[PDB]
Design an enzyme around this catalytic site. Sequence first.
Site, PDB file in Angstrom:
ATOM      1  N   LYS B  10       0.321 -84.738 -60.827  1.00 32.25           N
ATOM      2  CA  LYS B  10      -0.808 -84.867 -60.469  1.00 32.25           C
ATOM      3  C   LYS B  10      -2.422 -84.060 -60.892  1.00 32.25           C
ATOM      4  CE  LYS B  10      -2.528 -89.352 -58.838  1.00 32.25           C
ATOM      5  NZ  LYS B  10      -2.112 -90.453 -59.369  1.00 32.25           N
ATOM      6  N   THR B  57       3.441 -89.811 -58.325  1.00 32.94           N
ATOM      7  CA  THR B  57       1.921 -88.661 -58.476  1.00 32.94           C
ATOM      8  C   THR B  57       1.274 -89.283 -57.254  1.00 32.94           C
ATOM      9  OG1 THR B  57       1.072 -90.928 -59.873  1.00 32.94           O
ATOM     10  CG2 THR B  57       2.838 -89.026 -60.739  1.00 32.94           C
ATOM     11  N   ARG B 176     -24.983 -53.858 -82.900  1.00 31.46           N
ATOM     12  CA  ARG B 176     -24.811 -55.418 -83.133  1.00 31.46           C
ATOM     13  C   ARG B 176     -24.527 -55.772 -81.805  1.00 31.46           C
ATOM     14  NH1 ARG B 176     -18.841 -57.030 -84.697  1.00 31.46           N
ATOM     15  NH2 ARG B 176     -17.954 -56.358 -82.680  1.00 31.46           N
ATOM     16  N   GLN B 228     -11.414 -55.052 -79.497  1.00 29.43           N
ATOM     17  CA  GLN B 228      -9.898 -55.404 -79.437  1.00 29.43           C
ATOM     18  C   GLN B 228     -10.260 -53.882 -78.453  1.00 29.43           C
ATOM     19  OE1 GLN B 228     -11.432 -56.128 -81.997  1.00 29.43           O
ATOM     20  NE2 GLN B 228      -9.723 -56.804 -82.963  1.00 29.43           N
ATOM     21  N   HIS B 256     -20.634 -64.839 -82.350  1.00 24.23           N
ATOM     22  CA  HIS B 256     -21.794 -64.282 -83.343  1.00 24.23           C
ATOM     23  C   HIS B 256     -23.177 -64.693 -83.407  1.00 24.23           C
ATOM     24  CE1 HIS B 256     -18.054 -63.302 -84.893  1.00 24.23           C
ATOM     25  NE2 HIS B 256     -17.237 -64.464 -85.143  1.00 24.23           N
TER      26      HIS B 256
HETATM   27  O1  8HX Z   1       4.890 -94.884 -64.824  1.00 27.74           O
HETATM   28  C1  8HX Z   1       4.514 -94.371 -63.427  1.00 27.74           C
HETATM   29  N1  8HX Z   1       5.111 -93.326 -63.186  1.00 27.74           N
HETATM   30  C2  8HX Z   1       5.209 -91.960 -62.036  1.00 27.74           C
HETATM   31  O2  8HX Z   1       5.968 -90.836 -61.611  1.00 27.74           O
HETATM   32  C3  8HX Z   1       3.919 -93.257 -61.188  1.00 27.74           C
HETATM   33  N2  8HX Z   1       3.772 -92.244 -59.979  1.00 27.74           N
HETATM   34  C4  8HX Z   1       2.565 -92.619 -59.542  1.00 27.74           C
HETATM   35  O3  8HX Z   1       1.875 -93.078 -58.348  1.00 27.74           O
HETATM   36  N3  8HX Z   1       2.489 -93.970 -60.694  1.00 27.74           N
HETATM   37  C5  8HX Z   1       3.663 -94.180 -61.778  1.00 27.74           C
HETATM   38  N4  8HX Z   1       3.988 -94.539 -62.641  1.00 27.74           N
HETATM   39  O1  8HX Z   2     -15.294 -56.569 -82.364  1.00 25.23           O
HETATM   40  C1  8HX Z   2     -14.751 -57.404 -83.240  1.00 25.23           C
HETATM   41  N1  8HX Z   2     -12.885 -57.246 -83.793  1.00 25.23           N
HETATM   42  C2  8HX Z   2     -12.728 -57.399 -84.717  1.00 25.23           C
HETATM   43  O2  8HX Z   2     -11.671 -58.407 -85.060  1.00 25.23           O
HETATM   44  C3  8HX Z   2     -13.845 -58.190 -85.778  1.00 25.23           C
HETATM   45  N2  8HX Z   2     -13.680 -58.898 -86.945  1.00 25.23           N
HETATM   46  C4  8HX Z   2     -14.997 -59.316 -87.682  1.00 25.23           C
HETATM   47  O3  8HX Z   2     -15.419 -59.818 -88.587  1.00 25.23           O
HETATM   48  N3  8HX Z   2     -15.906 -58.845 -86.552  1.00 25.23           N
HETATM   49  C5  8HX Z   2     -15.248 -58.128 -85.586  1.00 25.23           C
HETATM   50  N4  8HX Z   2     -15.475 -57.526 -84.513  1.00 25.23           N
HETATM   51 CL    CL Z   3       1.310 -91.622 -62.634  1.00 24.81          CL
HETATM   52 CL    CL Z   4     -13.822 -61.048 -84.705  1.00 18.12          CL
END
Ligand code: 8HX
Ligand code: 8HX
Ligand code: CL
Ligand code: CL
Lengths: 295, 295, 295, 295
Positions: B10, B57, B176, B228, B256
């Site tokens: 779920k 589920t 920058r 980096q 950017h």
């Molecule tokens: O197709 C289903 N598979 C499941 O495992 C399932 N579990 C539910 O509560 N309903 C379901 N329906």
């Molecule tokens: O911090 C950066 N790392 C990058 O690899 C990079 N490549 C750019 O074009 N600008 C950047 N700035």
């Molecule tokens: Cl389900």
């Molecule tokens: Cl970058």
Amino acid sequence: SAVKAARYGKDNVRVYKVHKDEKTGVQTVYEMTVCVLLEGEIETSYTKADNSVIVATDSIKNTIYITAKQNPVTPPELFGSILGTHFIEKYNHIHAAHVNIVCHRWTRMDIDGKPHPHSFIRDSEEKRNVQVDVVEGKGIDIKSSLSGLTVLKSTNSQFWGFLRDEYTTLKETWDRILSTDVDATWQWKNFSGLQEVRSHVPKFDATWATAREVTLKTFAEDNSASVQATMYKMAEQILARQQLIETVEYSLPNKHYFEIDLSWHKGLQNTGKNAEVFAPQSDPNGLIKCTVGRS
Amino acid sequence: SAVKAARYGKDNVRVYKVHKDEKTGVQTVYEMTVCVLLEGEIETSYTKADNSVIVATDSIKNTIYITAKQNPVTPPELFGSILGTHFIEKYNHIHAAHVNIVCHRWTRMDIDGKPHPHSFIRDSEEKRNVQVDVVEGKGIDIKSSLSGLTVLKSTNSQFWGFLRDEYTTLKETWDRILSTDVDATWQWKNFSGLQEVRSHVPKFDATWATAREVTLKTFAEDNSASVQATMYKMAEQILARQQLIETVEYSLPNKHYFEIDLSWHKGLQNTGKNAEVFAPQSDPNGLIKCTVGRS
Amino acid sequence: SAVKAARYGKDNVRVYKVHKDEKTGVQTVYEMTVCVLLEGEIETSYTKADNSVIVATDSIKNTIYITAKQNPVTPPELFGSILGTHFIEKYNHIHAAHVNIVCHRWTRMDIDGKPHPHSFIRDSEEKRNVQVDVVEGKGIDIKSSLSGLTVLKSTNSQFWGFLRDEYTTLKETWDRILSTDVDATWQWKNFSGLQEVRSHVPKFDATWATAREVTLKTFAEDNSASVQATMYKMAEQILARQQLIETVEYSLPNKHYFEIDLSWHKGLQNTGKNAEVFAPQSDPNGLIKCTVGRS
Amino acid sequence: SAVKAARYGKDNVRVYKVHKDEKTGVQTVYEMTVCVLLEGEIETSYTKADNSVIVATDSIKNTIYITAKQNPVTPPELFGSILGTHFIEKYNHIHAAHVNIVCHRWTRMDIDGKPHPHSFIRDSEEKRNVQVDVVEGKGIDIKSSLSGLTVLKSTNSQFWGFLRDEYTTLKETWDRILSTDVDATWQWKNFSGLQEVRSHVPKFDATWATAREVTLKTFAEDNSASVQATMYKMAEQILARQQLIETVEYSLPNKHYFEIDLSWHKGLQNTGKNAEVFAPQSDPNGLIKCTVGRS
Ligand SMILES: O=c1[nH]c(=O)c2nc(O)[nH]c2[nH]1
Ligand SMILES: O=c1[nH]c(=O)c2nc(O)[nH]c2[nH]1
Ligand SMILES: [Cl-]
Ligand SMILES: [Cl-]
Ligand SMILES: O=c1[nH]c(=O)c2nc(O)[nH]c2[nH]1
Ligand SMILES: O=c1[nH]c(=O)c2nc(O)[nH]c2[nH]1
Ligand SMILES: [Cl-]
Ligand SMILES: [Cl-]
Ligand code: NA
Ligand code: NA
Ligand code: NA
Ligand code: NA
């Protein structure tokens, strides 16, 4: 047929600007995403294939960069008003400019308890936005907002006393989880032009900070009767503290966290007062909206 | 044909757990997204339509909730080891369990300078993860990691002296922008079983904090000769401070930010020492990886 | 400490190429997203800040464009092998190249029942991928795949006879919805070099088509006893029809669609044979994997 | 302060419905994602913490499922009008309902040239949507649309004769790539109520098909002078063929594909008439909008 409305421009223009204090060696960065849409006497580009009236969207992109180079980009309310004013003043046939700005967060790192001069961290996907409508003859309308502010409180939220009828299965509760992604917008009084916008520049950052603080404090402290009731209190406070604001709009998802009944397994108790493990729900979700103004 | 390998379970099981201190009234929340994949003598469910060997589920989902209810969910290294051990001990034909956990951030709000007892804020999309492989007869292998830690420094990054040939157009630079979304993984010495994992519980949170602090401090302070060179220094330190770690792997995008030549416009200067406005690039992006171990 | 492994390059390099038939006027487009990671004697760029051994990632980007210009980009298995071979032949210290290619769909439009010469439509987010590992002295290993092939059958799927214990709540069923997003990978016999890859060029497109047809036909026609049982039948057929394939791996989400009990509302019947309206579940989801080879 | 506007409801409600023909054994599936927002006399839930006026969003979710069970879900224009009418008729204080529906594609598989009775394939992320506003006393306003229809033509697109000034760097061209993700919306004449909507049911599917066919044919065949000029032709045709439509709105991204100058490498020619390899741009992008009505 006829052209009833038309607007065109450039969207998703990413902009970064750096300020360098020669004295202190302290650098401050700003990043935003900008959209500009223009209106005007441009109908014949649609109807007659007449491109002479089109200020190319590529040129609009260029203009955003140039404007950012020559002017302050903060507060965004100001930058947007400058950018929009430019288009209606520069081009005689362009009568409205609509500018949307999304500000991204680059928060100064604290390294060894000390603010670092040129390193930053995206400390949240929360945004600060503005929508600026510059209309020739009608001034400058600005809508400020914050969005993507995601919160959760594990108690002190209630929801009872709602309408019950034959479509209702929801149980009343006096203790639940409340989580939402806040979207808040405050609309400013119409400004007459750039000069008036400039005159209120200090109010923009201050009002954004107040809207955020009020949202957070009210969420945290209100013994919530409902999302509706809680968001109204937020809006009410923001209006009370900034008279230049006309309205405040909240839009709040109610992101549900369901209890899990595990009693089928060895009488394990995991509901009500015994609830420890919950299942967050991706969907569906409540959606609550309100616009609050002055009486 | 034959079944060479098989695993099923779920994925995307969202879990929320709340702890409540009866004394202080202070509540602490944990949210995670869990995946469990099982292996074993289950080939005949594929080849013979024999479902008798299948632990549904859905049952696996149930087991995740029950386990979270009855055990601590922090540190995630411990919870994952408990969850995986359960499956190989409980079911005689299930000989391996693979448990992936993504921890989401719910940070206690500060309201009026004071930590709030039950309100939280998603203060970043940064995650803390673990991959736990529990194999019958071979112990417990744990890979801890942090991801989505997005940073940017506006200076003190260089890149010159690289290979130049007829495929090279990139100019050497001594100043920058460097921005990346950090993905760091530290692999622990194989543990013999749950008892040994329990004996080192305090080391898991401490080592996560050290990996984060080392990553941030080294990024901020290193006059980077390259991505980096910088990432190697990070890995070297983490290994030196935790002897129970065998390897450290970094995977770093080079996001950017291009200079914008605006000289075509009124001789505007915006390159080299005059560079203020940049264009962030969504794609492409450099991708640098390194795995560092002990000599 | 020591460098145990290292690879670096360029990711998310978007490439578009157009072919123009001078005779018919018929144009054909190809779009892909390419990643190239190199290994070799490059440890001193990490340990000694020695960039002389670094073929800049920007140069790698350039090389992708140039290679696409001078060579066919289809089938992707061939293009990837050419691109990877180039790096290990060109640079004496670079001993491995890893090339990932994601092909996007541009399907010729039918306009008025007639194929259009130069208009296309993204008729699905389904991809066709390849992973090509070119290692000096060890040849060329190719893994072909299709992904994002999303299907659903509304009946003729069953799941009963599974293990039941105290963690089981799932009811046996003889009629359910089955929906999945297919991920299928077929690994080719190791090739000695480019010349051998060229000699089998027609087999790549043919084998992709067969894998897709077999997946679709088997899904549609099999009275499924389980996802496990169904996917094994697919893998078995693909192996039987292409002897140059060594293994076939399927990874299938089980995307659940739950019945909705509406009996609380006026005795409305919507379960079992009366089930019409279902709730699709975003999460969680089953995840079933199998690798099938030759006996 | 006062409540100027308020609406609340449930968003992202996923719904699946199956139809089974008892005769032919042929099954047809429908999947959609539904949002319902209500307005009315609900201000006191915000101002007075009065939840008696709130029809819980959970109840709204229930109502969507029940309505889908008892009514046809196709065409979506009809289903939306039924769903919205229900809320304003059922609750005396609820005076408007806003219903958004996103239809997902489940296309019947062809297996061996023959339509399969109960197997389907998501043959595109293209949607078919509707926005239905049901206002008490004012009828039913419906906006139909298609979205996510992504196309590309490799020639027969031009852009020259545009405004050139000191902000312009873009070169005029008589041959370029044009690619966009189509968003088209047609707004219907206001309907008086459900009975009138029912009376035009056959027109909804027919008009969706015509809007799609016109969009595709016009894109493919128009020797485009600009995105503006091309989209106007589409809108003009759709209006001419359905008199019940009042307006048609297009919103089209211009997704750029840049030429790559490779002349620096051995005089390689890859621009103008020699252009074969292009670099697709993720961002920025042009954004062109137009609303066309009747004169
Ligand atoms: O197709 C289903 N598979 C499941 O495992 C399932 N579990 C539910 O509560 N309903 C379901 N329906
Ligand atoms: O911090 C950066 N790392 C990058 O690899 C990079 N490549 C750019 O074009 N600008 C950047 N700035
Ligand atoms: Cl389900
Ligand atoms: Cl970058
Ligand atoms: O705060 C809430 N407002 C609502 O309108 C609502 N409706 C629910 O079902 N829950 C709710 N919680
Ligand atoms: O079709 C186009 N319309 C435009 O307004 C436009 N502006 C550009 O720069 N390119 C364009 N292409
Ligand atoms: Cl809600
Ligand atoms: Cl454009
Ligand atoms: Na003007
Ligand atoms: Na076992
Ligand atoms: Na070599
Ligand atoms: Na009413």
